[model samples]
Target chain A: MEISQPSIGIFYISKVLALAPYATVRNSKGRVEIGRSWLFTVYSATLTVVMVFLTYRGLLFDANSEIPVRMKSATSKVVTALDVSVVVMAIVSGVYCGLFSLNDTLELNDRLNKIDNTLNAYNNFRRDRWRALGMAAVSLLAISILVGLDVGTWMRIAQDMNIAQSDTELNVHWYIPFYSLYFILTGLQVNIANTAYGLGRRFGRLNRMLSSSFLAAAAKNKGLLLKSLADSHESLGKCVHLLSNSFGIAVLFILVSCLLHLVATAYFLFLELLSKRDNGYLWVQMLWICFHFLRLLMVVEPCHLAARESRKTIQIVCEIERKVHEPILAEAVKKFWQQLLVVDADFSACGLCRVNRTILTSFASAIATYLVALIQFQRT
Target chain B: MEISQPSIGIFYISKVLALAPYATVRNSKGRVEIGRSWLFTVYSATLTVVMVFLTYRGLLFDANSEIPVRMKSATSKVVTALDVSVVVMAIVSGVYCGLFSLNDTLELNDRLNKIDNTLNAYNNFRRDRWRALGMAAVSLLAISILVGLDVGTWMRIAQDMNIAQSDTELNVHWYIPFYSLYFILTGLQVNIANTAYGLGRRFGRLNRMLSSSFLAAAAKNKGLLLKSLADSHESLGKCVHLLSNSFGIAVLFILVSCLLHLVATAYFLFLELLSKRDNGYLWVQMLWICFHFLRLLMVVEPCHLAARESRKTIQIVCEIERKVHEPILAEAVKKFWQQLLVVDADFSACGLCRVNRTILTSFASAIATYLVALIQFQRT
Candidate 1:
């Protein structure tokens, strides 16, 4: 049984998500009738284009040359390529699922509620409410940075890389800065927030199911608990991959996009560090870099938390429970683990690759290689 | 059992490698009773320095000059970095296992023979021999290139990248070119040969173990056979990771090295097509590239083959043999599946990662991201 009654906000977020999707195709009682979201598609697509434009603008695209001098520079090619890969990956991944429908969201929500238990015994929703509130605090910080960076960048651009433009009526395209905000948040926060809450509740429930599997009625009532335990495991795996099946592919895109943004901007800060202009510019550059990284964490934090839960479930399966004396419970637990091998569930970016906190090593090495290449090629 | 008695060459290669080292401390009987080979260590360590020289020389290690400039107008850092990553990996991997002692080698060989069963109804070794022979032929081609390229390079360097010193008595450092050969082969061929054979035999045995697990001693001998089947799986997993355990981390290093070599050189060939170089260089370059790849495959092919065998054991457990109507056999088979879940054995690389043919996707994307970073960073 689900614990706390899902609050109105969590009713949409956590409560529906504890049930398994692929494990059991629950009938259409909680399923909502809806269609695709045209607005998100338009907004997300436009954001993809803008991200490409910004990436190109920062690193390569220039007016006086063919696609910018950086692409031709042996020294600059590494960073130039990184910026482009993120944009292209974004475009590809975005378009791959750019056509996110309310139907998909609603269907996923329906899948979460499929187990038909709206009440949790452990108050998983309340446990997760603090988490959601914490997310809002971070998002607010990101919001200020987002707005702060946009205004400073726009002001700098309007000045046209000089102070003289301040004397004249100078205007930069309003869409440039807003587009980043639109795309980054939509891809990261909006998608992951609900998934985290849903999966978080499910994770809590999966434990309850597993624990109940051990202590629930003996012999006669044991089979029923066994079924419950098996269902919980199967569903937990489904929720682990929840983002991929629904409108969640954007999370990967967003993560890569943010990582590239952080890297590209960090490179820019490096360039600025080489020759000092003024204190204000340096401050802006540093703040902007930190903002991008914070934004990246916003995408990954939830995924990392949820990934830990799934991994923990695996560990639980490996351990003995209160039912060492209960054969039925043992059989149920055994079957639960058997399904883990078959499911092979983990976080993935479409079919591109698996993503998790595990990627941090890979990320560090990639950045280091790129930095070395940049300096070496420049010297060459 | 082992096929064709490992031949004289194959015997040295395969027969010495069938025992399981990690599972049991088989006494020093078949263990060859040798100590570490200081000569090979000196030879291998020197090769690591030369590989670093070559890797650095190829990617970027010059003053007052850039690389001869081949990637995309001699303008791509990605290709340069890729070429270097191969040797860096080769060096790291070489050093990782550079101290390959007769003791380690013999110890591993001892592990191979530890299982104490070379005779079987079906032969995995015989099936794998031709594949080993194919590796030898390609190795021959690589030797020619190593020698031919060295001679040609020695003449050219003496002539200062503009020499016709072919007629002159010119000699270059023999260690420069030989380093690649010494280190790459040590890391690939030497280690993979035995691990592959051991796993191959184990896999072959696993199938027999499963097949015999059913359709044997009806109700009387059934539990014993089932236990054997389970033990076979557990041991096969241990055997599959033979290279990883007895200083086998080099397999992953070798795979990535070959992959980097493949991409870097392919890009070189793309540049060569532009120059329309003489057919002789084309053949040599292509052959060298092919050799690096084959050497890499030699490391994995056996592991892949053996891994397939272990995987098949699971299938045999699932399927009934000629005894489909036997309930006792079916019951035994079900228990066998349950245990498979518990053991969860597969091929691995020093426990850092699992290495199966299934990693192709991770491999592809990893290479792609590195490639992009190389190019983009240069552009910036």
Candidate 2:
């Protein structure tokens, strides 16, 4: 029952990623391979140009889509610009991943293979693949519903303002290409989560293998056992680094986009509550607030778990050292402990912040800070 | 000669702190002691009441003090409220230090004494007291000049608007009380810097003692030496924690104040340059900009250095461990290394941010971010 590939959850995402034209690296013959996707790059670029031109001509949006009462809401121009930037940034991140992060992506896949091969003897290596795929499917389904519902709400708003009747088809033209671009961003983040989750599972498996139950009778060969464990640990740490290197840019931009979107929605929510205006748009905005928040959490939680599991490995080693009596075993533990100190596998959002639970708190504060500043500006 | 108290710079600042009657702890009989100072508290309260009353009456300022032409500048009321908050925050921090942080302050002093007593046999234990005191004095002198020059510029502006001459004495009344409050804030920051500087020096001295030359002949007694060093290091780490606990609130508020002042001054500078306004106020704002910027750096650098030096101790131990062949010595080094891993002496501003060099970069980015946001709001 030894699986040559990564656990099922990662494998499912990897397959989807490979079939997509954005990624340069893909799974082939049970191994990772790198090849440029120039055709898709041009295709994405062409789509982007069309969206921008349509947006510039003002043909792709209803006149009433802009919020009424200029001073009370964020300007339509700023909101539109933000919307277009989200799509442009998605392409940029895709291109960045395919080109700039090619090597690290390859190395990260290679690191995964090595870990899987080394841990094949253990029966506890398999992760719940179906659950991972189900979660991914549900999230995508939710995103689709949210997007469709938002467009419907906008169309209704245009009808209420009597601007959508004649130009309905033209107004609906922007959703497909732009929403797909948004999909690309969400897909990339989901893929990152799947990859980090796989890494964390691998670390957890290693910890279980090194547990006292497994190591009890290995005293004579303790050096060999510890060395093997240390090597695996070192590989996992390198994999974490490679993951960060390959995904840092995308993560940084996606997080920022999500934050700005969150702020915009929250501001809208605030104004809606204040004026007791239409609840039609209010429900959509509330859903969007949740969507963006969950998107951020999807990326952060797995990385945090991977880092925490790595730290737990160190704690296990310390406990083992406390019980060991032989000089050689003690020396081996000492060497392992020292190694653990340097190669801490914590994840950071690019280099701006540590990607852990504390970051969520900071994000909350940053949101509140910006929201208050914007409200103060509105009052003036 | 062994100084019974902290180094001269800290001692000088501590004496001033005691005389101010805001602090509950002070130097007594050549040691740190805690006692109440109710009389000065009442006196300070009375002065605060008068300042608030005068401010309410609107008789303590020049009519021209508010920046003219409302749309282009930050509102005059917002600026005045920020000014008053600065003074109120200073008192809050002083009260916070005295009432809340009393025990940690006392323990931090005790930790310093233990480290000093342990290292008394070493002649290199003394810090450059005069240099520390000299720097503190020079900073205070610069602050005095900046404050006086700013007020003089304001008076000139008042005269230009034909407001100062009619009530010259009344305009001058606010300077003494409010400016003294400003001075209290500066003094607190400077004291934090000095305290962190002393901790860094002690860490540095410990590092020097553990240098290869000093340890070359001590291999046989390495366990004893290492144990003693570990104790001193642990104490230093506690001292760091206590310092953060005692000073965190003030550091947090002071940092925020500095950031806001920096932003306001920078905005004024931007508008001044744009409009070709009076050069007198321009010079004062520019100087205030430097003053606030330096004030932040003064607090951050020492804390950064102390953390760096503590990490360096780990590096030194690793080097020592590499050369040790004896089991006992190796065991001692290993234990010491383990201890080092846990008690890392990094300082934080409350729990908000790590007080290190990276913080300064983040500050620059935050200032830029808020400045751009504010400028955008103004345009809208």
Candidate 3:
């Protein structure tokens, strides 16, 4: 029996879809944001069910015995489709979230007469957000294309094997694109998260201030209103700090995982090239992987430099607050600023921060270790 | 005309010795209680020299062809001798440092009469220090054995290539013993460092207290002496906290690096076993590259972590101090306590510490990744 490539694509799509809802729910809750929860749930479930049905019918209960063989060829095809779908979802959701959040930030100053200044800041924020989104979208697109290629190659292999073709040999030339995309996208995602966090924090503060001030204006109790506004500011500050910290941790882990994948891919390619077992294709793949990894690393450098600058700005803010005449307010502001800096400072400056950084780095290194072994087929 | 392996061994020994005097001067100055200006000079010089040497040797030398073909066979033989020397140096140096530091802590309380409790604590500290030293010694032994095995293998390859007919192949099958020692010893080193840091902090505190009390007892101006003692205690507390923080970062980086090396080694071994490729033997030599790379990462981790932690802790301490007291002394104590808590509390509740307790669990995942890759290769 021979199964079609489409059916195999359906199978992988189904498997991933089954897990997608849970992942979405967990991630969304952790992010403390609402944007694509419903869209992902629907798309993921539909894909999973469709894939499962096609795979079962084509492989197990098809009229022709050859259908089973054909279905086997579809594995790569199915994975490719799933990868594309995932990439689209990620970009759409990421951009949507960034824009929606920015809009909310701008609406906060609706009553304020400082129109020119607010508009300029709003425009700048949107530009930054969109740039980050564009980078993320490109990264996702690259990954999808690679996965699509993998599926196409696998489908051909299955079809050849089913007919007992002698010339049907497995070629891993497709892996170069797949692995490179995997790494570059991972790095891009990290940068996106960092930018998103910064934008989110800035907006969150504005929203809190506007809301608190409006409430105070309505109450007609100036002293109480002032106190309430200050309290709101403190709360908003804490939330922003926490959001940034968590995002930073998550992005760092993802980056590490991506690097591991690239290293593993490179090791296997090196082996094939050295042994002359493969055609000259291995060298070409190695070049691509190297090029893309370097590109991603370079892109990340600017973001890191920007983050360092922001940290310095926060330090100056703290210094000014420290010298204030009003001790209580200064002390409170200092605490808030410190909390914010906890997430902002370069990791090397703090001990607890360093511990966290080291642990995450170690985790990444450990995972990379195994991935490298797997790529090389060491045990077999 | 091939260079002799013995000559290469001597070259490395000389290099290590030349570096050692600068390191000794830096370390000795750092240990001094007062007049620390000289410490900075020695520290800067040692660091500069290390950086220069590493850059020149690692970048300029052709590691692949530094020695002649004939001497290449004797490379392992020389490495074995060098390993033996390293093992002895590590043990002797480690123990000497441990014992002297422990003794220094103990002798601070020599003048006290009702010192049973203090004596007991000092004894416990000594025991812990020695235990850590023993573990470190075991680690050194293991590393030496691994190096010896590596040397033995290189010798065989050299003989097979007819580069050295006079060099007899060592009879031992070195792989099993070498890796076993490497794994156990690396783990032991981590354990020792963890214990040593805890004990070191305790000793540091005890020494500070003794010094303060001694100053008070000797000075004729009791009030002034008490005030000075109080100031000294606060400074010492800050310094002790910094030391432990630094130690923690170093240990964490080392552990992470070691894990990465193990993973890389395991993958290399797996490839050799499965592929039946003679070139697999060359992978073992790459361990030195991994080791050195890891060492660099370790150095960087501490610097990054320290900077981040200090900024956060300083802010937190300042806030707490402002809230609690108006007097300068009380404010100082409050700041010290806050710093102390920041380091200690987080250390106790660390998730990484929990993960370390279950380190062996990662091995299963590593094995599984290897197996899956093998299956894929077979199918292909």
Q: Judging by TM-score against the true structure, name the best candidate.
A: 2
Off by over 4 Å in 3: A1-82, A99-380, B1-203, B206-257, B260-335, B344-380
**Candidate 1 Cα outliers beyond 4 Å, as residue runs:** A1-327, A330-380, B1-81, B90-148, B151-154, B157-197, B209-219, B234-256, B266-280, B314-321, B324-329, B337-380
Model 3 per-residue lDDT tens digits across residues B1-380:
00012122221221232211111211342221212123433543454344434423322231233333222333233334333233233323322222223222223212121122333344354565454455445445545655665666656654565434332233222223333323333432333333334333343444444334332232334334333333333333333333333233334434444444444444445545577655537455455544534433323333333333433434443444455333544544443443333232122111233222233345346546644554454445
Q: Give the per-residue lDDT digits (tens) of candidate 3, residues A129-155.
A: 455455545555655664555455445
Local accuracy of candidate 2 as per-residue lDDT tens digits, B4-105: 233545444533543133333445545545444566555545654565455434422433434232111335546655765765575457545644554565
RMSD for each model, in Å, please? 11.7, 11.1, 15.4
Sorted by lDDT (best first), the order is: 2, 1, 3
The TM-score measured for candidate 1 stands at: 0.53
Model 2, range A1-380, lDDT digits (tens) per residue? 01123334433443343313333333655564544456655554565466545544442344454433111133655765675576557546644554455557667767777777767666342345564666667677877898898878876764565443354434555455556556556666667777787788788888987784334646658677777788888999888888787777777777778778888889878777767767878999899999989988887787878886887687677656656677777788778878987775888656887776556647876995789687776667
Better of 1 and 3 by DockQ: 3
CAPRI quality band, candidate 1: incorrect
Alpha carbon RMSD to native, model 1: 11.7
| Highest lDDT against the true fold, candidate | 2
